[PDB]
Amino acid sequence: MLRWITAGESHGRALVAVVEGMVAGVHVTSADIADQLARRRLGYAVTVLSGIRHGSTLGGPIAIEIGNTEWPKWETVMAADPVDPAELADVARNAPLTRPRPGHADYAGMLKYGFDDARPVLERASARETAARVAAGTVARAFLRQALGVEVLSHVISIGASAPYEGPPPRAEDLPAIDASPVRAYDKAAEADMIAQIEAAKKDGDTLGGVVEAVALGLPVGLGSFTSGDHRLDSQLAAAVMGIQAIKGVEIGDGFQTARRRGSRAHDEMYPGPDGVVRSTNRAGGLEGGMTNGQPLRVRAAMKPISTVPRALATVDLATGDEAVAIHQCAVPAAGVVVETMVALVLARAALEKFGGDSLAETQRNIAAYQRSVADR
């Protein structure tokens, strides 16, 4: 049973991702992880410490370290061990952060943990942590591809007030074009609209959020279950995606728009096919009653504008109780990449749950046999 953990402060020495429960024999390398970390940097130092040998998973815990290049600047302010308080009071960088940014973990985090300073909160809350997620996600990704022939990608639906691209989702062969787009858009018209919204926001010195859609292709029928709320795959995906920094909404398939349609036009009808049932629409986004139906999985995430707009947001100085202005510390296309990663981690877990196995070869045997059994129906 797959588990993943991230660790690290934004300005700490390094980030760590640990993945536990991954079967032995999955091919994945430092380079794969770096490639995926590079994809996270798209939009307008990796060390594998354990669990992988000669590019193949060992079956034990996989620990992946991501170095922080800025560490020399932070090694006193973010030092693990005590530092002379007199030497530290002379360090401008160590100044108190007492003006919580609206929209961020600052205020609630300070109160919750009894902090006088927001620094310990933002260091961990920061979306720099998503880099560790992506390191972990790459392992799930390699597993999904090699065990199931499953591919995970994403594309941006809207940024700011752009008109949502509601056409067909991309396939895996479209990923280079998507990744090459400044807004990771699949649709050229939608692309132009989004770039325009960004240009105008940039000019106004403002910030934007957006909507992104992860797509997983090639899934077998029956991952997740209808047996309880927690086992529904959409429940698990929603947790994994909503828990991403700045995400305020999650949809499966046509999501909130489904809730505005009539039953006669809301669902995906089934028809006879050569190698099983075929559907002509995918309004469900590949999930029905908590399980994969074989159609492309579509998961959409709504990201709020996350970058603090300079001198726009009133706040309070918790030190004084006086009015203040939040001092700043779009990322929509990268959010799409992070969503891919969380979707992959969840899918990989659900796959190991149904197909079991301790090595890829074993898991592959069980998959094959389940597929043969379904075909023989």
Added chain:
Amino acid sequence: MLRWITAGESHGRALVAVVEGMVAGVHVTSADIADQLARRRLGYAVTVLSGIRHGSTLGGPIAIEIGNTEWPKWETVMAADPVDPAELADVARNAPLTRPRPGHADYAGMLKYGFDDARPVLERASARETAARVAAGTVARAFLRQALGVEVLSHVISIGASAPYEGPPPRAEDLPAIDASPVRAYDKAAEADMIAQIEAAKKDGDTLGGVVEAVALGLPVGLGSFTSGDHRLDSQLAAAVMGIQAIKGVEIGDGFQTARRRGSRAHDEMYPGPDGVVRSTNRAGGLEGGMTNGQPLRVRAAMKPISTVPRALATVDLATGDEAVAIHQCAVPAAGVVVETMVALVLARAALEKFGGDSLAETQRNIAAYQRSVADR
């Protein structure tokens, strides 16, 4: 650490809800549970078996049984023990269900579990299970009220193509009026619009979904955490709400609309107040960076139309591979009630996580002290 489990088939003898980890000394009765089960039946036999003594929780597992009144009709078809297969083949009610309904667990469930018959799938997948959830939810509810003075309610935002009510959410004092509404609407104009959509759908012999909003009031700052994706309260709520039958989307606060706003207008600014920070908007829906900020928690759920529209939905007969039509087996206002329940279960768990305690009095002491500590800031 609070856990909840539901058990039961729709036409089985009874449903069971088990709640584990609830502190001793919470006042809750059979009548409370029945009251909340009654609320679930709003819209256009309870036996407490364990864990409660004289209307006060014991600290052990709380098992709540909900009887099925139709059991005599089903006691052979849904018999636990073997039944002579010749006697059963003469029972019309035991006929094979081999035409999976689009939008339901039928097809994927049959394939996943190797079933030839959809009966075992729909029996457990059916939203009749939400009654067991609500039994469990009532315990969390009583805890939230008595430990924290927290109230949970809901109201319907839209049904079918109605214009979404986007005005202010209701307070606890508005619940009778909401519950008295045929569509559990808070807004009279929105109400009329929704009733109209329903009337027209009824006439067309069609079905509707909708959007509902659970509201939790009185929450302390700091439930949930920013420390990882799984600990974010919005992550937990999303899992609990998305896992409800027929839910296709979840939002916190202004959700997907936040993703279409500029940073300067997207967030909730903070200002000085007498007894702490005050905000003038609640676009975040009471959650920031994974934690409660003290504002009303707003959680919205998108429900797809769930009732099968007679002779509209093409499907396949899995027995033959031939075309077929799905045979049928809005519920928006009741969905709102179920969402309340899932929100309450999650909030109660997060509260016990931060405030600990083995009895209500102990948990109340820790709450009080945390609140004093925050006030003294």
Added chain:
Amino acid sequence: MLRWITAGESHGRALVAVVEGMVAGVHVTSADIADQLARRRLGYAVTVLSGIRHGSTLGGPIAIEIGNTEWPKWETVMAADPVDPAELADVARNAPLTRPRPGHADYAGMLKYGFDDARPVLERASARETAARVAAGTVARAFLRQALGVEVLSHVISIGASAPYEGPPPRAEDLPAIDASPVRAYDKAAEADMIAQIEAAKKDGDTLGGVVEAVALGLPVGLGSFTSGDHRLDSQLAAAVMGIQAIKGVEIGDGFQTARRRGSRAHDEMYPGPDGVVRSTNRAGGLEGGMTNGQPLRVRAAMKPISTVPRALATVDLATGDEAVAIHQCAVPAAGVVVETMVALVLARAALEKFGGDSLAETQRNIAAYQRSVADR
């Protein structure tokens, strides 16, 4: 992933066992459960509410209710709902329990939960709860037999000061003789010694504990893992067995005696065989480095004397702070039966972890294929 929960107070209306995550298609009936509950009653009303249809598991949560026959006597004192406090003060049975028994949950439970009365503590702490465990255990048992040809049994090693039977463990064919023994002894000489110890203790009006050994036969190699402490099968078994009421020690195989042997004589040497490796000793008790090695699994549990000895044990009246004497509310052979049950639950979970599957047939395919793969080595 198998989970089990028990609920119920000793004098409550009923006990409930819930088992979640069990694959569909396992044959098990009310009668099987009753048979195993009967075995628990060896030594000197079952209702299946959910998850089983026509004697075959459905794949959903399995809820099993066990009625309390004494309920009419307790329905006011252990009433779930409030009862007039004046009517209750006239009930002798509802008298305060304020003299905690040494060796029991009484004192620590009262302090922990802020109880003035030990009643809520002993009602849940009581070993009557093991009946619910055994109901749950029967499902795991049926699964182990049908999926893996695995059998679980037990026998008593010692009671009181008897000389421990250290000969060979029994096989499944020996269970009737063991069950027919007044002390569930496998060895006739050991039996006579144990009966003598009991006779002498009975005469002295005293109580005894003992040591029991669960044996699981037919296990495949490789359940559990060496990958971390929590995944070691011996870790899981130890948790499941030590958590049984009155158990103070757990051993795998030769346990504490292994720690007194030299490395040259402590382990089980391997030799070539026709259908795989064979060992001539089983000092390890079928577990090495956290995993099953194919040898009989042997798990031993040390039970303390649990029955309070009348007027022997000094205690304190918490109401007054005055000296008092504990007022009483062997069971070694039944402990053996309970240990069987906990071993079976853990083994079944570990099996589903490695072999996966959502139905027995699927799990059986994966098992077969893993076994073929091992044979082809």
Added chain:
Amino acid sequence: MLRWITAGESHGRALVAVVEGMVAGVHVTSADIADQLARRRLGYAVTVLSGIRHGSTLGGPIAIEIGNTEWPKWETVMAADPVDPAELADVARNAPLTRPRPGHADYAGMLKYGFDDARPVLERASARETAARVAAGTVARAFLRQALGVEVLSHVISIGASAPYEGPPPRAEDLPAIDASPVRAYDKAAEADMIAQIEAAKKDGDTLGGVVEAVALGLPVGLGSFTSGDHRLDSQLAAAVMGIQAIKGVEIGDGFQTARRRGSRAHDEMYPGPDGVVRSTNRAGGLEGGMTNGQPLRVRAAMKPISTVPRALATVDLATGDEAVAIHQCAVPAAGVVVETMVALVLARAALEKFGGDSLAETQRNIAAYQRSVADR
């Protein structure tokens, strides 16, 4: 809710310990961790990557890296990324390991994971992993001391055939003398006996196991619970201790010897005292009915001889199916140190479970208040 994870192969680049859920404000440093790692090396390079700032925990995940000094020798054989298979076949160090050692994870691990080589199994299974545990344990240790004034230590009861020290356990002030002993013995006579057994085994070229006892002092009443098997503190401790490499048995207090006593002499009687109940014996080892009773917690672990005895143990070459002899790759006093660590991790988790809190100060308030409440009884 405290969680701990270890990662690393014995000859990999480094070990990683991650601790999640630890409250903010606990004072612990690199030096503390190194000190405790040094204690693990008693008997006949630490880098804190995250979660700690200026010697005080941040509340987020704490990642601790322990470097392997031998890494340059292993950086090709245990390289994470692929290495030219022709270059690797010339490396003597990379030779196949196909003769599983009796008593080790080798055989079952190879079969389970489909390995042809035991290397991936022993790399992770090796007790070198306990160093990562101890890094994690140090955090729990600091928490226990600062939140609860709790101290954890250990001493060796027996090694090989020595006569078990059954006198009183040590207190915290005795730790230097214990740590200074070659066998970490508390008792001088027992010490001499153990050294003799070792001398004789060394001379015979053989290996020994032993029994160790962890002692935790200063615990509040009521950690753990009687509410179910999994919540019993003895259940949790047993899992944590049995899961240590080479441990074959666990006891609480007088353990297996309790099972040989009569009820009248088996338990710890309670008597009136100035500041609460007092006991004159501690046969229970500080745990009753699943919870701490305030007495010293005593947990004993039986370690099998772990070092392979050269040319004594027959095995099979899995490559050929031919007879072979196991080639080798006491540690009792260090086992005691590891047991301390696992006990501390479990106690710290149980403490956070009851007392909650997100910072030490908050947890301390809740502790104080629970203690006052108990005193006022």
